[PDB]
Design a binder for this molecule. Structure first.
Ligand SMILES: Nc1ncnc2c1ncn2[C@@H]1O[C@H](COP(=O)(O)O)[C@@H](OP(=O)(O)O)[C@H]1O
Ligand SMILES: Nc1ncnc2c1ncn2[C@@H]1O[C@H](COP(=O)(O)O)[C@@H](OP(=O)(O)O)[C@H]1O
Lengths: 245, 245
């Protein structure tokens, strides 16, 4: 059914049990929360932050489960959304490689489940929409996986403004260079290669898979797609939320 | 390489050898030529004519190989085109069942070949374009597989006008009913079931496969498709030729 991915080393926590543990989490103002739907840019965005700095709390929770401490102590929250199609496809190939995960079966089979939101991490729909609703009320930066690919400088530009932090021009690119998909894929300290293949086999699918927006186009039949649109446009009626693909 | 499909019982004739044999074919005016690219509505259109009447010459030849006799004797030529995507998909699943045919291999592999026109029956592109250029110079009725599905009455309406022939309203629908895909599929006299499975196995793919326009959408990845369009738009620059899909 429905749990959530966590990381002492990647594993499944029952959302509730996990929420009970975090329920009354206390937050120092300097703390920096980073939230994302799974396979929506996390490991990437993280290393972008970790770069900018060198306390970062990584959380795949929906907005309505963030410990109030954070709201109260107006913590800086970076949030990253990624278009659903790509997020779906990335998340699919993931189930198809991570042993921790349930069997994805067919790609048509997975879809039905994904749109129903009946997959590890809740509904991507409910997830992204909550956060967007929150960007109105909180110290949240809302970023889009695609816009980063589009303009890494133009994006990190923003992050800095948000953090009051101010880097070099060389130190700047030093970051951009590393947080390119090419460099990061060949990087054992992020690429999750240095892992049990019983846990994650890259010979099936590598965590750092393709990392191109628009890749979904390589898997979604013109039918499955025109299906995805109709179902999407429904769940997103009213939303001011908008994606490049 | 490149031959053509014929029918004492369906078989491969080397296009040239076959054209040499037909080169100086003599044509009585009353004769009715029906031409089509393969898997573009032939067996359907045939039975429509056979119906309307009960001499019909069935030919899968390109316009520039029709024996001049026919031109000279201004014969009535019904021509049927079917949109390429569908035509491709239909023709693909066909190779994948008809033993007479070469191996289609992958569906991506087949595509390359189809667009290159390097498949049994020549280039669908060169085929339909020639016939369209001819509709300007000859007693040719140019029909579209899709328009038929769209409005069989509204289509057969035309055929009659073209033939001067004039049927009943009941005799009319009697025809429409039979030349529906549903009726025809369960019909041994057209459905090619009554055949050697060494020649054609329906347990793989039935000649009367789906018979819905828009079916291709069930096979062509949003990439393969956006690929097909770009390549198509090229070969069809200038053409006034146009398809529903
Ligand atoms: N530096 C980078 N630039 C672009 N995409 C990256 C990246 N690092 C990781 N990704 C992509 O992030 C996705 C996993 O997201 P998360 O970090 O949220 O689990 C993968 O998508 P693909 O599966 O499309 O390749 C991966 O390729
Ligand atoms: N009465 C009918 N109405 C619609 N389509 C028909 C039909 N009879 C045959 N077809 C379709 O004609 C195609 C074969 O064409 P041809 O007669 O030129 O070989 C098949 O397409 P599919 O493979 O898309 O099902 C078949 O389904």
């Amino acid at each position: 059914f429905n749990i959530m991915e966590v990381d002492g080393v990647p594993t499944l926590i029952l959302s509730k049990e996990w929420w009970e543990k975090v329920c009354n989490f206390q937050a120092k103002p300097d703390d920096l929360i980073l939230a994302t739907y799974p396979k929506s840019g996390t490991t990437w965005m993280h290393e972008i932050l970790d770069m900018i700095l060198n306390q970062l709390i990584k959380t795949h929770l929906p907005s309505h489960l963030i410990p109030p401490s954070i709201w109260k102590e107006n913590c800086k929250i970076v949030y990253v959304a990624r278009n659903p199609k790509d997020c779906l496809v990335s998340y699919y190939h993931f189930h198809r490689m991570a042993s921790f995960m349930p069997d994805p079966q067919n790609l048509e089979e997975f879809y039905e489940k994904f749109m129903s939101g009946k997959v590890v991490g809740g509904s991507w729909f409910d997830h992204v929409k909550g956060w967007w609703a929150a960007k109105d009320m909180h110290r949240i930066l809302y970023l889009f996986y695609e816009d980063i690919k589009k303009d890494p400088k133009r994006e990190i530009e923003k992050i800095l403004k948000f953090l009051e932090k101010d880097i070099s021009e060389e130190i700047l690119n030093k970051i951009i260079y590393h947080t390119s998909f090419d460099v990061m894929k060949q990087n054992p300290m992020t690429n999750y290669t240095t892992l049990p293949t019983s846990i994650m086999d890259h010979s099936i699918s590598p965590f750092m898979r393709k990392g191109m927006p628009g890749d979904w186009k390589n898997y979604f039949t013109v039918a499955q797609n025109e299906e995805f649109d109709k179902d999407y446009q429904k769940k997103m009626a009213g939303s001011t939320l908008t994606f490049r693909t």
